[PDB]
């Protein structure tokens, strides 16, 4: 866009949008529900 | 079906059973006999 090539700029921007949306909205980001931090002592105290 | 209300208690109890063996074997292997 600084240089002046509008077609290449448009293609690059489209690829940027596609990649950013795929990265942000990946289902793999949400993997497990929250485990309470005030209940981990019940997980680590009894054995360790 | 399992209990569905016993994930913490089961973890505690099974870990305690394992720690029983761990502690007993640790004492027997580490400490040595002494008089009085």
């Amino acid at each position: 866009l600084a240089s002046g090539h509008l077609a290449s700029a448009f293609v690059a921007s489209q690829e940027a949008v596609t990649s950013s949306e795929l990265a942000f909205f990946d289902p793999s980001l949400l993997h497990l529900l929250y485990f309470p931090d005030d209940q981990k002592f019940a997980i680590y105290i009894p054995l360790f | 079906t399992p209990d569905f209300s016993m994930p913490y208690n089961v973890i505690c109890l099974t870990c305690t059973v394992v720690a029983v063996c761990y502690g007993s074997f640790y004492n027997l292997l580490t400490r040595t006999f002494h008089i009085e």
Partner: peptide, 27 residues
């Protein structure tokens, strides 16, 4: 109304820890 799943810290962790530590290690 209902009950969420919460650990019984006083009831079981204390019991199953004082069944190990004073029985074997500390004394």
């Amino acid at each position: 109304g209902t009950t969420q799943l919460r650990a019984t810290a006083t009831t079981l962790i204390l019991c199953c820890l004082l069944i190990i530590l004073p029985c074997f290690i500390l004394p």
